[PDB]
Design an enzyme around this catalytic site. Structure first.
Site, short mmCIF file in Angstrom:
data_model
loop_
_atom_site.label_atom_id
_atom_site.label_comp_id
_atom_site.label_asym_id
_atom_site.label_seq_id
_atom_site.Cartn_x
_atom_site.Cartn_y
_atom_site.Cartn_z
N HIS A 171 0.58 -2.21 -2.96
CA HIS A 171 -0.15 -2.82 -4.10
C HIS A 171 0.15 -2.22 -5.51
O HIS A 171 0.66 -2.93 -6.38
CB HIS A 171 -1.67 -2.81 -3.86
CG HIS A 171 -2.14 -3.38 -2.56
ND1 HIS A 171 -1.95 -4.72 -2.23
CD2 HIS A 171 -2.88 -2.80 -1.58
CE1 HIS A 171 -2.57 -4.90 -1.08
NE2 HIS A 171 -3.14 -3.77 -0.65
O1 LIG Z 1 -7.97 -2.74 1.92
C1 LIG Z 1 -8.38 -2.25 0.75
N1 LIG Z 1 -9.71 -2.40 0.39
C2 LIG Z 1 -10.10 -1.95 -0.82
N2 LIG Z 1 -9.26 -1.35 -1.70
C3 LIG Z 1 -7.97 -1.20 -1.34
C4 LIG Z 1 -6.83 -0.65 -2.07
C5 LIG Z 1 -6.84 -0.25 -3.55
N3 LIG Z 1 -7.46 -1.29 -4.37
C6 LIG Z 1 -6.41 -2.18 -4.88
C7 LIG Z 1 -6.10 -3.36 -3.95
O2 LIG Z 1 -7.30 -3.98 -3.56
C8 LIG Z 1 -5.22 -1.24 -5.12
O3 LIG Z 1 -5.11 -0.88 -6.49
C9 LIG Z 1 -5.46 -0.02 -4.20
O4 LIG Z 1 -5.47 1.22 -4.90
C10 LIG Z 1 -5.76 -0.74 -1.24
N4 LIG Z 1 -6.11 -1.34 -0.07
C11 LIG Z 1 -7.45 -1.63 -0.10
#
Ligand SMILES: O=c1[nH]cnc2c([C@@H]3N[C@H](CO)[C@@H](O)[C@H]3O)c[nH]c12
Ligand SMILES: O=c1[nH]cnc2c([C@@H]3N[C@H](CO)[C@@H](O)[C@H]3O)c[nH]c12
Ligand SMILES: [Ca+2]
Ligand SMILES: [Ca+2]
Lengths: 316, 316
Positions: free
Chosen positions: B240
């Protein structure tokens, strides 16, 4: 013959569907229930009664439904799509046939209770009457054979605004009641139906055909076609309601995905339809948790669907 | 060298990005601004200070931002994705370097005002500091060279629930302020970044490489990868934040669509991002009317993006 009730707001594409349905030998139309949307409920009733007469079946019951959504207020109608009269400004003389005394909601409850697990419902407009029948009778969802809904925009833009499709936007609360009722539901979104069109050439082919209602269907589609050109930039028409009728008789012309569907009822996304595919394990519970999934049309075999629609419209 | 401020909630993928950014030649990191999301703001500041030390740049300013979203209240953090400490439970000793006195919002306004039209902002967490900057200085949007945002789910499922992506859900009001600010914005949704992965094999290739931070990155990625296997059923990680950094330096590895983006702030669809592509002429005005469009990443050249990320992570 499979028993069918059509809940509809005729409506140019609704009228095409109703006339097709009367020509389908595998189908028994036990009634037409009317709703607002493309035109006011009173205009929808007038058109539905005229369609029964035109098809040579004035005995088929027409039950008038709700004049407003569950939340209330006089609804805005798509007269810029379907004309002032709801059938492309043909301004036809009034029908001789009269509607039944009972409401659409009461007709749906009575016919589903009379024939349990036999009656299918094809929903072509906002879902107000269907939601009213679910609320008034809690056994309705267990007694209805299937509910095939034309509505929503699944991972695609709406047609009222970027968020919502017209039928759902017309009554968001009713759509949410229907999608969470636990009944055997099949939803066909505009993400599917915008792939199924009749070009200007196809419409001319209809006019020149030996179809029983060819002249009438062509006159109606003129106003419908012009909206697609002004708004979508498309020279033809999208076959929304005829495609949902195709899903009733030939579900094998489509693929479906199972999942819980929720409807947004407030804010900028009022009327937005969202499905949980269930391919991801969520960390916590959400508004899509605990409900019974429904079938959402995912892909469409466009040549097979077009062949089926054209054969019904062009049948002498 | 292009001046860049990274607004971040480190965060495992955030840490990968920050460490890549320090090794990237055509970029000058003038500061790190912190926010909540993956961990509380205080935990994000601690990690950002540790990353500056690890990169051999303890002089790079770290400005602490907002502790809660614009509407207020203690935020829910993704500790089930990034661990209790925000970096996959490495439980590292505290940094010696200290944060600057000014807030992230004040640092953003000061550096963008110091170098008008020169400073780019890479937004990796909720958009609270960016929105505070826009609100405190209404000229901020016009002075920032570009704002590249990792956030949203455009015509795809969210990762918090079916409706919303985490960064947007963290502060929906802030995201709506940013997307309607009139600034030169590039949004990269999870509909794009879930296509760009590091498999278990790719992660093993990173561990066995001669990369400067290879050992540290691999240890931290263990907790992150595990969440993907438990929730998404994917054996590896979604890149991401590194993909959004790739959009800053190589926007040519993506295609973009112009359109007005609005954020739902209430109801079951709180945090939902929706773009009007402008391909349909609406009959009436809607919440997407009158705003300046922004650039939304539409497609991604996955091999080119993976090649660029891998070369930065594996550089000695
Ligand atoms: O599965 C997830 N749930 C919630 N947040 C994240 C993240 C974080 N939040 C963002 C993508 O939702 C990204 O900037 C990352 O730092 C990655 N995977 C997940
Ligand atoms: O462009 C449109 N805007 C609003 N309603 C419709 C309709 C009607 N509403 C439904 C599709 O939104 C469908 O059942 C049809 O009868 C067709 N095209 C449009
Ligand atoms: Ca209709
Ligand atoms: Ca982040």
């Amino acid at each position: 013959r499979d028993k069918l009730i059509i809940d509809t707001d005729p409506g140019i594409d609704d009228s095409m569907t109703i006339l097709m349905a009367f020509r389908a030998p595998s189908v028994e139309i036990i009634g037409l229930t009317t709703i607002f949307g493309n035109v006011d409920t009173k205009g929808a009733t007038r058109n539905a009664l005229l369609l029964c007469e035109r098809a040579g079946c004035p005995e088929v019951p027409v039950a008038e439904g709700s004049h407003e959504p569950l939340k209330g207020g006089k609804p805005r109608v798509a007269d810029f799509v379907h004309g002032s009269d709801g059938i492309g400004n043909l301004f036809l003389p009034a029908p001789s046939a009269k509607k039944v005394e009972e409401s659409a909601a009461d007709f749906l409850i009575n016919k589903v209770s009379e024939f349990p697990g036999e009656v299918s419902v094809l929903a072509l407009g906002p879902l107000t009457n269907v939601a009213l029948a679910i609320k008034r009778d809690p056994s309705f969802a267990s007694k209805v054979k299937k509910i095939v809904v034309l509505g929503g925009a699944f991972f695609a833009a709406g047609n009222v605004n970027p968020a919502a499709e017209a039928n759902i936007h017309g009554d968001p609360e009713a759509a949410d009641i229907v999608f969470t009722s636990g009944a055997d539901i099949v939803v066909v979104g505009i993400n599917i139906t915008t792939q199924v069109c009749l070009t200007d050439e196809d419409l001319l082919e209809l006019r020149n055909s030996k179809g029983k209602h060819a002249a009438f269907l062509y006159e109606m589609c003129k106003f419908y076609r012009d909206w697609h050109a002004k708004s979508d930039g498309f020279h033809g028409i999208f076959l929304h309601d005829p495609v949902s009728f195709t899903a009733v008789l030939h579900p094998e012309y489509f693929t479906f995905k199972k999942g819980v569907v929720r409807v947004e009822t407030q804010g900028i996304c009022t009327g937005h339809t969202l499905m949980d595919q269930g391919l991801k394990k969520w960390n916590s519970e959400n508004p899509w948790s605990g409900y019974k999934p429904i079938s959402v049309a995912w892909t469409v075999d466009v040549p097979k669907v077009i062949s089926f629609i054209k054969k019904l419209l062009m049948a002498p």
